[PDB]
Scaffold this active site. Structure first.
Site, PDB file in Angstrom:
ATOM      1  N   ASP A  90      70.276  34.625   2.330  1.00  0.00           N
ATOM      2  CA  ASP A  90      69.579  34.762   3.614  1.00  0.00           C
ATOM      3  C   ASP A  90      68.677  36.002   3.670  1.00  0.00           C
ATOM      4  OD1 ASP A  90      68.736  34.182   6.225  1.00  0.00           O
ATOM      5  OD2 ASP A  90      70.648  34.748   7.158  1.00  0.00           O
TER       6      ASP A  90
ATOM      7  N   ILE B 281      74.919  47.378  20.169  1.00  0.00           N
ATOM      8  CA  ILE B 281      73.712  47.686  19.395  1.00  0.00           C
ATOM      9  C   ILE B 281      73.297  46.528  18.479  1.00  0.00           C
ATOM     10  CG2 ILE B 281      74.076  50.170  19.498  1.00  0.00           C
ATOM     11  CD1 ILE B 281      75.265  50.125  16.751  1.00  0.00           C
TER      12      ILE B 281
ATOM     13  N   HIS C 228      76.175  35.808  15.936  1.00  0.00           N
ATOM     14  CA  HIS C 228      76.918  34.613  16.323  1.00  0.00           C
ATOM     15  C   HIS C 228      78.408  34.830  16.189  1.00  0.00           C
ATOM     16  CE1 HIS C 228      78.379  30.345  15.631  1.00  0.00           C
ATOM     17  NE2 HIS C 228      77.727  30.230  16.800  1.00  0.00           N
ATOM     18  N   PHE C 229      78.830  35.446  15.084  1.00  0.00           N
ATOM     19  CA  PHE C 229      80.255  35.717  14.832  1.00  0.00           C
ATOM     20  C   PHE C 229      80.804  36.944  15.562  1.00  0.00           C
ATOM     21  CE2 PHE C 229      79.889  32.320  12.144  1.00  0.00           C
ATOM     22  CZ  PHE C 229      79.318  32.541  10.905  1.00  0.00           C
ATOM     23  N   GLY C 230      79.942  37.777  16.144  1.00  0.00           N
ATOM     24  CA  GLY C 230      80.409  38.942  16.910  1.00  0.00           C
ATOM     25  C   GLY C 230      79.374  40.014  17.220  1.00  0.00           C
ATOM     26  N   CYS C 231      79.733  40.922  18.132  1.00  0.00           N
ATOM     27  CA  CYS C 231      78.870  42.030  18.549  1.00  0.00           C
ATOM     28  C   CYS C 231      79.087  43.277  17.686  1.00  0.00           C
ATOM     29  CB  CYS C 231      79.106  42.387  20.026  1.00  0.00           C
ATOM     30  SG  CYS C 231      78.459  41.189  21.222  1.00  0.00           S
ATOM     31  N   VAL C 232      78.097  44.165  17.694  1.00  0.00           N
ATOM     32  CA  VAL C 232      78.139  45.410  16.923  1.00  0.00           C
ATOM     33  C   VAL C 232      78.069  46.586  17.889  1.00  0.00           C
ATOM     34  CG1 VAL C 232      77.185  46.615  14.914  1.00  0.00           C
ATOM     35  CG2 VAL C 232      76.749  44.155  15.226  1.00  0.00           C
TER      36      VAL C 232
ATOM     37  N   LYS D 271      81.221  46.321  13.625  1.00  0.00           N
ATOM     38  CA  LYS D 271      81.043  44.904  13.921  1.00  0.00           C
ATOM     39  C   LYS D 271      82.387  44.225  14.177  1.00  0.00           C
ATOM     40  CE  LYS D 271      79.087  40.535  12.352  1.00  0.00           C
ATOM     41  NZ  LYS D 271      78.765  40.249  13.773  1.00  0.00           N
TER      42      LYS D 271
ATOM     43  N   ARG E 258      73.931  41.920  18.050  1.00  0.00           N
ATOM     44  CA  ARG E 258      74.540  40.664  18.490  1.00  0.00           C
ATOM     45  C   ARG E 258      74.425  39.621  17.398  1.00  0.00           C
ATOM     46  NH1 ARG E 258      75.830  40.029  23.698  1.00  0.00           N
ATOM     47  NH2 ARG E 258      75.082  41.586  25.215  1.00  0.00           N
TER      48      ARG E 258
ATOM     49  N   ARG F 102      64.326  40.128   8.994  1.00  0.00           N
ATOM     50  CA  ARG F 102      65.356  40.320  10.035  1.00  0.00           C
ATOM     51  C   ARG F 102      66.682  40.822   9.472  1.00  0.00           C
ATOM     52  NH1 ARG F 102      64.765  34.843   9.344  1.00  0.00           N
ATOM     53  NH2 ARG F 102      66.587  33.967   8.276  1.00  0.00           N
ATOM     54  N   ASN F 103      66.889  40.603   8.173  1.00  0.00           N
ATOM     55  CA  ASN F 103      68.146  40.907   7.485  1.00  0.00           C
ATOM     56  C   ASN F 103      68.094  42.136   6.551  1.00  0.00           C
ATOM     57  OD1 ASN F 103      69.538  38.895   8.832  1.00  0.00           O
ATOM     58  ND2 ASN F 103      68.943  37.295   7.363  1.00  0.00           N
TER      59      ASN F 103
HETATM   60  C1  LIG Z   1      67.253  49.459  17.200  1.00  0.00           C
HETATM   61  O1  LIG Z   1      68.458  49.469  16.401  1.00  0.00           O
HETATM   62  C2  LIG Z   1      69.474  50.279  17.037  1.00  0.00           C
HETATM   63  C3  LIG Z   1      70.551  50.604  16.021  1.00  0.00           C
HETATM   64  O2  LIG Z   1      71.550  49.575  16.101  1.00  0.00           O
HETATM   65  C4  LIG Z   1      72.168  49.298  14.925  1.00  0.00           C
HETATM   66  C5  LIG Z   1      72.323  50.273  13.947  1.00  0.00           C
HETATM   67  N1  LIG Z   1      72.935  49.988  12.802  1.00  0.00           N
HETATM   68  C6  LIG Z   1      73.424  48.759  12.557  1.00  0.00           C
HETATM   69  C7  LIG Z   1      74.051  48.513  11.347  1.00  0.00           C
HETATM   70  C8  LIG Z   1      74.556  47.245  11.080  1.00  0.00           C
HETATM   71  N2  LIG Z   1      74.437  46.205  12.037  1.00  0.00           N
HETATM   72  C9  LIG Z   1      74.991  44.875  11.708  1.00  0.00           C
HETATM   73  C10 LIG Z   1      76.426  45.007  11.164  1.00  0.00           C
HETATM   74  C11 LIG Z   1      74.079  44.313  10.627  1.00  0.00           C
HETATM   75  N3  LIG Z   1      74.299  44.270   9.319  1.00  0.00           N
HETATM   76  N4  LIG Z   1      73.315  43.753   8.751  1.00  0.00           N
HETATM   77  C12 LIG Z   1      72.374  43.427   9.636  1.00  0.00           C
HETATM   78  C13 LIG Z   1      71.114  42.845   9.532  1.00  0.00           C
HETATM   79  F1  LIG Z   1      70.671  42.509   8.310  1.00  0.00           F
HETATM   80  C14 LIG Z   1      70.346  42.631  10.673  1.00  0.00           C
HETATM   81  C15 LIG Z   1      70.830  42.993  11.939  1.00  0.00           C
HETATM   82  C16 LIG Z   1      70.109  42.769  13.112  1.00  0.00           C
HETATM   83  C17 LIG Z   1      70.432  43.220  14.333  1.00  0.00           C
HETATM   84  N5  LIG Z   1      69.522  42.772  15.197  1.00  0.00           N
HETATM   85  N6  LIG Z   1      68.713  42.083  14.562  1.00  0.00           N
HETATM   86  C18 LIG Z   1      67.550  41.412  15.186  1.00  0.00           C
HETATM   87  C19 LIG Z   1      69.018  42.021  13.262  1.00  0.00           C
HETATM   88  C20 LIG Z   1      72.095  43.576  12.036  1.00  0.00           C
HETATM   89  N7  LIG Z   1      72.834  43.791  10.879  1.00  0.00           N
HETATM   90  C21 LIG Z   1      73.816  46.454  13.250  1.00  0.00           C
HETATM   91  O3  LIG Z   1      73.706  45.549  14.079  1.00  0.00           O
HETATM   92  C22 LIG Z   1      73.302  47.735  13.505  1.00  0.00           C
HETATM   93  C23 LIG Z   1      72.669  48.017  14.707  1.00  0.00           C
END
Ligand SMILES: COCCOc1cnc2ccn([C@H](C)c3nnc4c(F)cc(-c5cnn(C)c5)cn34)c(=O)c2c1
Length: 289
Positions: free
Chosen positions: A145, A33, A37-41, A53, A35, A149-150
Site C-alpha cells: 500500500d 491525531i 479504520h482499525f483505530g484512532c491515534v 495507535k 484516524r 498518504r502512507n
Molecule cells: C498533521 O499531523 C499531526 C501529527 O499527527 C501524527 C503524528 N505522528 C503520527 C505517527 C503515526 N501515525 C499512524 C500510526 C500512522 N502510521 N503510519 C501512517 C501513515 F502512513 C499515514 C497516516 C495518516 C494519518 N492521516 N493521514 C491522512 C494519513 C498515519 N499513519 C499517525 O497517525 C500520526 C499522526
C-alpha cells in the site's frame, strides 16, 4: 497476557525489547491525531513525543503470539526513511507506539498552502521514499500500500515509508475499493495491472505504486485518474494509457515513472536503480528548503 512458550523459542529474548511498560507511557486520549479504520491515534509521552495507535475498532486482535511476532520483526527494521516501531504497550487491546511525525502524511504536506517545496524538494522526497523502499525490499518485505498518504514527515522534514506492520490501516478510506469476488478493500489506483488481476503483491508491484507516488509528488498531491471509476482502471490502463507528465516533472523523471509502470513486472527497475536514477536527476537542480 504474554505466553512466552507460545512464541518461536528463537524470539523469546526479543520480547523484552518490544514491550513497553505502562508506567513509561502517558497517552493523551483527549486529542486524536490520526484516524484509521482499525483505530484512532493519540499523542503520547514516552520525555519523548510519540504517536499511540489503538486497534480497538477491530473486534479482535487475532493470535497474540502472532501480534508479538509482527512487533518483533518490525522493531528490528531500522532506516532513516522507514517509520520505526518504538514498542507495544499492554492495557487491562494493546497500543502500538510509533515516533511522532510532526508534519503528518506526505500527501497532505504537499497539498498544504502554508508550505512551498521546490521541484528539487519534491524529487528529494521521492528519493527518500526510494531509499526506504530499497531497505524494505532488502528485507524481503512487500509493502502492498505504498502511496503519498502512507509516508510521513518528521520535524526535520525527513520522509519515512509508514503504514506497514502494526501501523497498517486505511487512513483515507476514499481510495480503497471493495473487490466483488474477494471482499478485500484495495488501493486500485496505486496497483499494478497484474495485482488488479491476481490480487498478489510483490516488490515489483510496490515499484508500480512508487511510480504513482512520484506522480503525486510532482502534481503536489493531485488524485490520480480522477475521471476513471474504481475497478474500471484495468480497462483504462489496457487501452494503452498512463498518467500524464505533470507540468513541472522533468522528462527523465517521467521516463522513470514509465519504467515503474512497465507491463512486464520483471522489467521494472529495482528500488536500488530508482535511488540511483533519481539521485542523478535530483543533483541537476539548484534551490530547496
Ligand atoms: C498533521 O499531523 C499531526 C501529527 O499527527 C501524527 C503524528 N505522528 C503520527 C505517527 C503515526 N501515525 C499512524 C500510526 C500512522 N502510521 N503510519 C501512517 C501513515 F502512513 C499515514 C497516516 C495518516 C494519518 N492521516 N493521514 C491522512 C494519513 C498515519 N499513519 C499517525 O497517525 C500520526 C499522526
Amino acid at each position: 497476557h504474554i505466553d512466552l512458550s507460545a512464541l518461536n523459542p528463537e524470539l523469546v529474548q526479543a520480547v523484552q525489547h518490544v514491550v513497553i511498560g505502562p508506567s513509561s507511557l502517558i497517552v493523551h486520549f483527549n486529542e486524536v491525531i490520526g484516524r484509521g479504520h482499525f483505530g484512532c491515534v493519540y499523542h503520547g509521552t514516552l520525555k519523548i513525543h510519540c504517536a499511540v495507535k489503538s486497534l480497538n475498532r477491530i473486534t479482535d486482535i487475532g493470535e497474540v503470539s502472532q501480534f508479538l511476532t509482527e512487533g518483533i520483526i518490525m522493531k528490528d527494521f531500522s532506516h532513516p526513511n522507514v517509520l520505526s516501531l518504538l514498542g507495544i504497550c499492554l492495557r487491562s487491546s494493546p497500543l502500538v507506539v510509533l515516533p511522532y511525525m510532526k508534519h503528518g502524511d506526505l500527501r497532505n504536506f504537499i497539498r498544504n498552502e502554508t508550505h512551498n517545496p521546490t521541484v528539487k524538494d519534491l524529487i528529494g522526497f521521492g528519493l527518500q521514499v526510494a531509499k526506504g523502499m530499497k531497505y524494505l525490499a532488502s528485507k524481503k518485505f512487500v509493502h502492498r500500500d505504498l502511496a503519498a498518504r502512507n509516508c510521513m514527515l518528521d520535524e526535520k522534514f525527513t520522509v519515512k515509508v509508514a503504514d506497514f506492520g502494526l501501523a497498517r490501516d486505511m487512513y483515507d478510506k476514499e481510495y480503497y475499493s471493495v473487490h466483488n469476488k474477494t471482499g478485500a478493500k484495495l488501493p486500485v489506483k496505486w496497483m499494478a495491472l497484474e495485482s488488479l488481476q491476481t490480487q498478489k503483491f510483490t516488490t515489483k508491484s510496490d515499484v508500480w505504486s512508487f511510480g504513482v507516488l512520484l506522480w503525486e509528488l510532482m502534481t503536489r498531491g493531485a488524485p490520480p485518474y480522477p475521471d476513471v471509476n474504481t475497478f474500471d482502471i484495468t480497462v483504462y490502463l489496457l487501452q494503452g494509457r498512463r498518467l500524464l507528465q505533470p507540468e513541472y516533472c522533468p522528462d527523465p523523471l517521467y521516463e522513470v515513472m514509465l519504467k515503474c509502470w512497465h507491463p512486464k513486472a520483471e522489467m521494472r527497475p529495482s528500488f536500488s536503480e530508482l535511488v540511483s536514477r533519481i539521485s542523478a536527476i535530483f543533483s541537476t537542480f539548484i534551490g530547496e528548503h
